[PDB]
Amino acid sequence: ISQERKNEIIKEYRVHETDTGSPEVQIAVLTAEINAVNEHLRTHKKDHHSRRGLLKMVGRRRHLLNYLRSKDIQRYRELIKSLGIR
């Protein structure tokens, strides 16, 4: 995804100004990137190498979503409805 679009996503989900590392920001950007590669894979179904990157991104999102639910369930519930992930 473009740095412009990424920056827009950070601003939408940043917990505080200057926040770039919160699970919310990281999950949101990951969600965008997963969708973009899923789009690539629809046209290019035999780009196995790119799909592997997508699999790693899905796992990293899962692990952060696991951590957030563990720490703050409200923050989790708000993030999943906002990003439409479940």
Place this chain on the structure above:
RNA sequence: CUACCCUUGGUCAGGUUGAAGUUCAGGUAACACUGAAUGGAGGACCGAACCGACUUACGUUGAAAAGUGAGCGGAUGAACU
């Protein structure tokens, strides 16, 4: 008459099975996929009309120059008319 064909018409009680697809639920990164429900496929199933003619008995100067009786096959189809 009969064979095939052309054009235009008609007919096929009732019962059964339950394809694809779809929807919902679950499931997935997205798909596969799973379960219900829905759906109504087929030279599909059983069985009358109808069409046929496997067996057998009768009939054999016949009721009949090819039939009758009892069973028998198909019966939405390459159907029958």
Place this chain on the structure above:
RNA sequence: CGGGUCCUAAGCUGAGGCCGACAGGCGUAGGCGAUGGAUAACAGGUUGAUAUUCCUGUACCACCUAUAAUCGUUUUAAUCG
């Protein structure tokens, strides 16, 4: 009411035309040709023998004649097409 004085399918025929010892074959325009399209009447009564056909009652369709509310009256704006 069914058919004709309506329509066309397959098919048949076919002015000229094309082809062919002859006879004749083929074929265009155009015709003909229902098994289909279009198309205005029903109930009751009645004979030994006919009936949506006769009769009784109540209808419908096309056309004609007359009188016509109204509308028009020649680039026409009433009307046919």
Place this chain on the structure above:
RNA sequence: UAAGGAACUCGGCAAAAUGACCCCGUAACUUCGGGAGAAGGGGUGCUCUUUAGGGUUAACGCCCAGAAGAGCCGCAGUGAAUAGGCCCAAGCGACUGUUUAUCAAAAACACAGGUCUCUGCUAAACCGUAAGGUGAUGUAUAGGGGCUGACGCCUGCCCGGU
């Protein structure tokens, strides 16, 4: 129709047996569809009592349709009539279908599929002396002809002869 029960016979030919509906249950094998109604069993009348319902109605009523229990009668309750016999193997043909009108219905024909070959379009092929047609108002994923015949696994060697 005693007793027997295929001893009959070329051969169970014919006959007998099975048969309805409901419930339980159901194998090898398989192309996963099937096989299957597999098979093998159980129930079925009438009366009374209690009692889930559904359709149509304001309701009543009417129509449909169960369940449980307790009784009654006969040799027997789909009390008549009508309604699969079944199973295990082997050959052949995949299959539905077609055929010797009137001695053969089949393992024969056809078939979807395979393959070879011809054919560039006024196509090849076919009918006609021709004209004119079919092919096709189609155009090589098409059309004619030969052979093979679902599907699965396969399909070896020989071009000397014709």
Place this chain on the structure above:
RNA sequence: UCCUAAGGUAGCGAAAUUCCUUGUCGGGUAAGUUCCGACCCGCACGAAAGGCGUAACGAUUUGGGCACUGUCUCAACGAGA
């Protein structure tokens, strides 16, 4: 060693093909020229005049069970033409 264009492969096999032949052995039967399995000395199988399998299907051909019975032992009686 001789010959050929090349010498039949896989699979299958007393077979819708096997003369000899009721081959031989095993199974099934009290007893089986049929049948099934196996064997291979294939008279004279063999790969699209296809080879070998094959679920489903068959008024197909074939062998064996269960049930059933006047088919039979072996006939008898009754109804009707």
Place this chain on the structure above:
RNA sequence: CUGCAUUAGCUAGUUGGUAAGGUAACGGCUUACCAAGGCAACGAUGCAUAGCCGACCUGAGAGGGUGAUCGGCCACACUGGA
């Protein structure tokens, strides 16, 4: 406190509830009714094998093997039912 996954599904009185009956007694123990539960890779279900233990044999120990005599508990009494 036992082996086997070349045993992965198992169960319909089954899991729970309600009521009644029944038992010294609690309880699906049983029976109607209602619901769809219960169990299982932390090995259910199946199959095989086996009485269990105090002990006993061995081993430096940790372990391994075994379950005579004696004592405890359980089960059985020709087989099966009452």
Place this chain on the structure above:
RNA sequence: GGGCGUAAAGCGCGCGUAGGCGGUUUUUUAAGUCUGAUGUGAAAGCCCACGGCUCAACCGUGGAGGGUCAUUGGAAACUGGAAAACUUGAGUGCAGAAGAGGAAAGUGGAAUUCCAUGUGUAGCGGUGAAAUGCGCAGAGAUAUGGAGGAACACCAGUGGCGAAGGCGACUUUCUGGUCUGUAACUGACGCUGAUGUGCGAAAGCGUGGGGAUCAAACAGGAUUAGAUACCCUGGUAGUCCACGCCGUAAACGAUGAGUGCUAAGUGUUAGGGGGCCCCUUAGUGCUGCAGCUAACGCAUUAAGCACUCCGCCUGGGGAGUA
């Protein structure tokens, strides 16, 4: 109280689920842990002591011991639980870097084969030597043109990239990962990974397309005792493309992954920093201590020293068979 480079043994390689394991500080709790008390763990036996049998065996008596036991009282370091912090791990941002990483279109040039003509002539081709073959119906050779498929010389390097298998003309589009610096941010969010789930050379299989080259099978020639080979001339599948299937290789570093620690010297790839030199990060080679090893060897790219987790081994054959 053993191992898995070469002896038997690292899954071909990822993505991940359960499970196992997990950085630093504080506070608290007390499940594990530690320390007592109480009850109980029959008797017999074992063990120890003593006593009785002439001794011993044996008999008797008293201790001692035997729980993964229960109940209850303390301790709190560690493990666990709870609460609150931290930034070193792990990520994110920001600023840079290189790359045959992947997918899909498009564009080139060399060469091979075939076909068409011109010139031209008696061979060409091939081998150890031959022959089959091709050619005289004009071959081969040479010149020019056309058709088609496949692969990309030079660059090119123990070079680069990728989890592995792999990836080499160029262009564009889409897309994955990695490294350096910085220290915005988050704040242990981590590691491994049974069962799962994907990817996976080549050959092979299915459907459709394509067919230059090479080439199982197959056919000639030759060699040979024979030659079902090696060599020669041909040649089909296949080799190529698409989409499915297969799921295996000495899929190898015969070396599982993660983390930290432990002499040096030298080359190279992509960076960073400071004065050609020095320092530094991540790769990639060679050489070589300590240590390790049966030896060979390995040696900061461990096969050294450690901790976590997974897979695997237990004589050979039968057999990777039934």
Place this chain on the structure above:
RNA sequence: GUCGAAGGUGGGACAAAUGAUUGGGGUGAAGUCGUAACAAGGUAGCCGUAUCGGAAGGUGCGGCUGGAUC
């Protein structure tokens, strides 16, 4: 009358024995055929795969060194 041992009937499951015949394995004469591997084993060998051949094996494709004189 309910329940009910034993018994009967039926379709399945599992186990063991046996069966014409057939398959590979093992062992055992100094049997027959060839010579595939070990040396550059006389075509380096081996791994996966495909196909072919009396037999070991051959050949194609990819891979490995656990090969490669000068």
Place this chain on the structure above:
RNA sequence: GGUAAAAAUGGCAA
């Protein structure tokens, strides 16, 4: 660059 081609076999003991 090469390269000459062909080039089989030989009981178990001690």
